[PDB]
Design a protein around this ligand. Structure first.
Ligand code: ADP
Ligand code: ADP
Ligand code: ADP
Ligand code: MG
Ligand code: MG
Ligand code: MG
Lengths: 372, 7, 152, 394, 372, 7
């Protein structure tokens, strides 16, 4: 029958599905490929367009472009294609019969969501729509209503505390260090071994190596010492052609940047200090529950042994009597969307929808009035 | 190089 | 002219590492339960007693024609050679004519395996043995010796 | 033939052999050597009954070579003699060959890659001004080979009489920075065989004796497999000596030469060419491509050209590539070599792959008007009409 | 009285001299020639391998091999020969009495420095040594402490931004694209005229054609039409055997690969965008000083028209109110060596050497802690 | 060819 679609559209990987399911129906790396070589044969397929897994497959002759970068849609001529593909080619459903719940990171350009609403209501002709913060979705995906959502996608990382359903905007923290920055740092440090990756195609290989073999250390200096002393901490990966490379010390040097951004030259604070600061910006009467219900989410917090590291860090920073518990669900990689589908199955969210005529009567700015 | 490029 | 580039990649013989090469199968019962072949003590007892025909037949009673162990094969070969190279040159025809076709097809293998490690007069008698065994069994025996896949 | 009755001819114009026919055909209608001969007298030959014209071309100029001085109009894919080439083309479109009225026909021509542009420009000029063709297209040879095989990806190793070239193509997108071109082919192998035979006391110094040595290299010679084992066979045994009867009647004996003349493709330093063999050049061409295309390039190695018909060339190429891969990718891990999957596609009719691909492409694009270079466009622009193909010339 | 040796050893050309001079004592191509014929005039000076200039004067009968490709030493037996020829035949000085200041490209594998130190301390037995980044010496020699160095050697092109002496290692960029690739691309585009150069002894003739005739066009899409309309741009060259070639259009299509690497089949951006991105990676405050102090160096930047085109590019790329000044002196072919000789002569440097005692205590792994 | 090699 008639339901409400849910299109996360986070950076790196676009997720989409139908409300009610426990997993996004169509998830694909949100990229656009473009051929950098001139075709000569008749019979070859499309040109100037390759989206998702189709682009990932033929990346050997394409240049890849992420339309989203650090949470801000840089090129709309490609994001429109991404939406067209996830509507007509992956979910395989007309977008003029279903509400759509999009997601946006906190503290973003207003024109971003303005153009989002304008494109949703002007090209795909959806009946209604809604844009929500990813954190609120993540907490609404954990079934909790009191916690500090620590989300970390590929282009943004944000700590958002929420208490009794009330969101505190004064304490929302957003660090820009995220997954793709870790991928770049890995590409840079892999040169020490002698492995050069400089193509946007081989960036995918590096990203897969990262999310397959990289793990964040519990004690950085001790792990460095053990890696420098012995070879019992060296893993082997196999490139697509068939070569086998070895990564040792890099394995934990790559994710360690999340706690010491100075590795990237970014003179800022880590993600654990960001969590601690976003907590210390809340009222004094609620800091303990936030200390107790820290929830993680996103495809950049699945590194083995990250929950214990964050817990150690916060406990070192937080007072002794305060108890620290890092709620790390082993499904967080899609948690926000799960939250998305959840927020789409409540009779309380079936009236917060920005109607088509509501957009017509006031223009695209209505997103700021209705959506928070 | 060892991986990527020759050197 | 001459080549000033590395050509050492031609020395590696990948054909010995092939996966479609021919491997000689052997039966699972013939690989698990090995046959010890002849009993040497019985043979020395029958030789001390002085009966040549019965010692000959006891040398060909059972043979490691199914095992893969080199020690048992070498020992059985040694015993049967000890029996063959000790006959009188006259009683060879009588001993040969007392064997079935398989007996001759095995005696020819034990002969052709005695030429490879000869002694002062081992081959001079193995040649007479070969003469009689070929008179009885014909070239088919020599061919069943050549085209065998397990040597005794 | 298209919807206008204008025959669509396909002509390969190779350095060592012309293969011509019509579009959609399954076999070249005419395959004849590309050489032009002129009658001469020799003190060792006597013929007085076969009429020899003042200009023999093609097949008759090769079968009657004993009484002619022959010369090829092409060399290394570059037309050295334009008058002899015009005679060869007059004969090709003449009555005792493909019989067409060139005023009302389209033609599909070829050309090797990385070739001087004045060559193609002059060929198009000749085709539009002398024969006045109604349409001309000049396709790429590797593209035609992949058309004939029925693929969209693969690394064409096209080794003709005049020149060897390795061209990879991925998913239909041509990578022109990986096109390699080695200048050793049938003709240099024939010259090396002439040298080796001269070491034995036979002298082939005339223009006609070159075709005799060519026909010897085609019957007897073969590419070795384990060159140490082949040298052991040639030095220890006598099972490689084979006799051949020259046209005059002499009987020559060819031994180890059988595997030394065609070895100059894998070991060029034998003929004073400083480079790498066809196997090492293929491996470097592949390993110069992006990481995501190498694994598919290894599985679609398409052989083409006559000079790849030596008995045992696919297997030797595969063995060379496996050894290179074991030493320079797996760094010496024999366990992983069994996982390496090559597939050297050597079709049986691989001697005319370019013509079959041209036939397929012409059968596809005969009825279009944005594919062919029309004579009107030539009369209007000149040698600029070639910009239709994608080759920018002013 | 002991004076350090400044020995560059970059790809393509090795330049050695004494510390405290205004010009390198000995410059020679870093090649090793193996004879590819078997000569029987024994006793007439036959050898097994000719190094440096002795190879060029014989390149007709030799196979020339470069031990350093893209800044990485691919053959250490040959590099030991290069260094021995530098020490005992070009400089004529024992190495065991002077410290040696070598140079290296940024983002090279650590094995390169490790083996450089191991060779300089175990084979040549030097009392002290050092390894410096080339683009830092290229700023030392320019008489500055703030600027972005754009060093484009024969085999590698890297950009290093420095401000007030504090280098920004998070903005150092590298591009494996230099004279050796321009020379191999000219060898390809020369076939359009009919000229076929293939032997390693003709790559030198092509490199000479490139370094004597080729220039960088200020406007490529206009100079193409110019060279197409009239023959007022052709130049003739005389091969060492008599034949004459003529090249009209290739002249600026050879160095145009620097600004459009797609000509060579490379995804990476040109040198102007490589410099601009490396500027915009720094902080907002120091970008104005980096703009107006853009230094050039290395042989590949010795093209007539390189500074004009670089300025026209980085000015159309930089904000409209920033002043761009391409510092390009005619002595930039050897700025790195002058910087090395300046650095090695300073007094405050005499404590930055790596002493033989230090190497005996920690092995070749020390060059990572001392050398920046 | 015109320069280099014959053709
Ligand atoms: N198990 C994992 N460990 C480390 N990194 C991962 C893992 N899974 C995914 N990633 C990384 O997360 C990045 C993007 O995924 P994700 O953050 O889920 O996208 P989004 O920001 O839209 O949620 C990718 O670069 C990927 O490599
Ligand atoms: N079976 C064969 N074995 C070895 N060499 C051959 C064979 N057939 C032809 N050749 C060589 O290759 C040439 C023919 O190849 P072909 O592809 O027709 O050349 P072209 O480039 O002229 O089309 C002949 O000149 C001959 O020297
Ligand atoms: N005047 C010039 N014009 C054009 N290219 C040049 C010039 N001088 C040098 N080159 C190119 O740059 C390289 C020489 O640079 P060089 O500074 O010697 O490199 P390195 O310092 O790494 O040895 C050569 O390969 C050459 O192709
Ligand atoms: Mg996200
Ligand atoms: Mg051909
Ligand atoms: Mg330099």
């Amino acid at each position: 029958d008639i339901a409400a679609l849910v299109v996360d559209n986070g950076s790196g990987m676009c997720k989409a599905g139908f409300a009610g399911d426990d997993a996004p129906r169509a998830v694909f790396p949100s990229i656009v490929g473009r051929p950098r070589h001139q075709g000569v044969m008749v019979g070859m397929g499309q040109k100037d367009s390759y989206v998702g897994d189709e682009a990932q497959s033929k990346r050997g002759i394409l240049t890849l472009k992420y339309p989203i970068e650090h949470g801000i849609v840089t090129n709309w001529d490609d994001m429109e294609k991404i939406w067209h593909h996830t509507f007509y080619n992956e979910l395989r459903v007309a977008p003029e019969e279903h509400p759509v719940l999009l997601t946006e990171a906190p503290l973003n350009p207003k024109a971003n969501r303005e153009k989002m609403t304008q494109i949703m209501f002007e090209t795909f002709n959806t009946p209604a729509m809604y844009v929500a913060i990813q954190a609120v979705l993540s907490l609404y995906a954990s079934g909790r209503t009191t916690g500090i959502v620590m989300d970390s996608g590929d282009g943004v990382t944000h700590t958002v505390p929420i208490y009794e359903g009330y969101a505190l905007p004064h304490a929302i923290l957003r660090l820009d260090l995220a997954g793709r920055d870790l991928t770049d740092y890995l590409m840079k440090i892999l040169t020490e071994r002698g492995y050069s990756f400089t193509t946007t195609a081989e960036r995918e290989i590096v990203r897969d190596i990262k999310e397959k073999l990289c793990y964040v250390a519990l004690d950085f200096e001790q792990e460095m010492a053990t890696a420098a002393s012995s070879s019992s901490l060296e893993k082997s990966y196999e490139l697509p052609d068939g070569q086998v490379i070895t990564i040792g010390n890099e394995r934990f040097r790559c994710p360690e940047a999340l706690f010491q951004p100075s590795f990237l030259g970014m003179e800022s604070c880590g993600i654990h200090e960001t969590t601690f600061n976003s907590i210390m910006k809340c009222d004094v009467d609620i800091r303990k529950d936030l200390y107790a219900n820290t929830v993680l989410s996103g495809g950049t917090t699945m590194y083995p042994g990250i929950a214990d590291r964050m817990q150690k860090e916060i406990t070192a920073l937080a007072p002794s009597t305060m108890k620290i518990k890092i709620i790390a669900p082993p499904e967080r990689k899609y948690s926000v969307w799960i939250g998305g589908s959840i927020l789409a199955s409540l009779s309380t969210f079936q009236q917060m929808w920005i109607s088509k005529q509501e957009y017509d009567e006031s223009g695209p700015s209505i997103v700021h009035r209705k959506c928070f | 190089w060892x991986a990527x490029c020759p050197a | 002219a001459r080549n000033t580039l590395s050509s050492r990649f031609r020395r590696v013989d990948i054909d010995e590492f092939d996966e479609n090469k021919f491997v000689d199968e052997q039966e699972e019962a013939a690989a698990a339960a090995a046959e010890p072949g002849p009993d040497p003590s019985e043979v020395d007892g029958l030789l001390r007693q002085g009966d040549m025909l019965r010692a000959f037949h006891a040398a060909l009673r059972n043979s490691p024609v199914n095992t893969k162990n080199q020690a048992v094969k070498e020992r059985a070969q040694g015993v049967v050679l000890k029996v063959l190279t000790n006959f009188k040159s006259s009683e060879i025809e009588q001993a040969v004519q007392s064997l079935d076709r398989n007996g001759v097809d095995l005696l020819m293998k034990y002969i052709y395996k005695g030429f490879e490690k000869p002694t002062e007069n081992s081959s001079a008698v193995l040649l007479q043995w070969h003469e009689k065994a070929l008179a009885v069994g014909g070239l088919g025996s020599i061919i069943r010796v050549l085209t065998a896949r397990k040597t005794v | 033939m298209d919807s206008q009755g204008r025959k669509v001819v396909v002509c390969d114009n190779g350095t060592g052999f012309v293969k011509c026919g019509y579009a959609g055909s399954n076999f070249p209608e005419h395959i004849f050597p590309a050489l032009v001969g002129r009658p001469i007298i020799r003190s060792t030959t006597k013929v007085g009954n076969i009429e020899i014209k003042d200009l023999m071309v093609g097949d008759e100029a090769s079968e009657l070579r004993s009484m002619l001085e022959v010369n090829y109009p092409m060399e290394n894919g570059i037309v050295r003699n334009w008058d002899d080439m015009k005679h060869l083309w007059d004969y090709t479109f003449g009555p005792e060959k493909l019989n067409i009225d060139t005023r009302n026909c389209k033609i599909l021509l070829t050309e090797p890659p990385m070739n001087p542009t004045k060559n193609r420009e002059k060929i198009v000029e000749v085709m539009f001004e002398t024969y006045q063709f109604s349409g001309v297209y000049v396709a790429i040879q590797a593209v035609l080979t992949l058309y004939a095989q029925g693929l969209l990806t693969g690394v064409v190793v096209d080794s003709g009489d005049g020149v060897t070239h390795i061209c990879p193509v991925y998913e239909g997108f041509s990578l022109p920075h990986l096109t390699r071109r080695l200048d050793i082919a049938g003709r240099d192998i024939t010259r090396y065989l002439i040298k080796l035979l001269l070491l034995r006391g036979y002298a082939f110094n005339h223009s006609a004796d070159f075709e005799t040595v060519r026909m010897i290299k085609e019957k007897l010679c073969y590419v070795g497999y384990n060159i140490e084992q082949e040298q052991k066979l040639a030095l220890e045994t006598t099972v490689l000596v084979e006799s051949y009867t020259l046209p005059d009647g002499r009987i020559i004996k060819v031994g180890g030469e059988r595997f030394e003349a065609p070895e100059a493709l894998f070991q060029p330093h034998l003929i004073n060419v400083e480079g790498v063999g066809v196997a090492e050049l293929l491996f470097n061409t592949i390993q110069a491509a992006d990481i995501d295309t190498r694994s598919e390039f290894y599985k679609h190695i398409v052989l083409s050209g006559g000079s790849t018909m030596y008995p045992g060339l696919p297997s030797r190429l595969e063995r060379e590539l496996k050894q290179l891969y074991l030493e320079r990718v797996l760094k010496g891990d024999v366990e992983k070599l069994s996982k390496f999957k090559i597939r050297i596609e050597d079709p049986p009719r691989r001697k005319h792959m370019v013509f079959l691909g041209g036939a397929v492409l012409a059968d596809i694009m005969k009825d279009k008007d944005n594919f062919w270079m029309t004579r009107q466009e030539y009369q209007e622009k000149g040698v600029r009409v070639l910009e239709k193909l994608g080759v920018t010339v002013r």
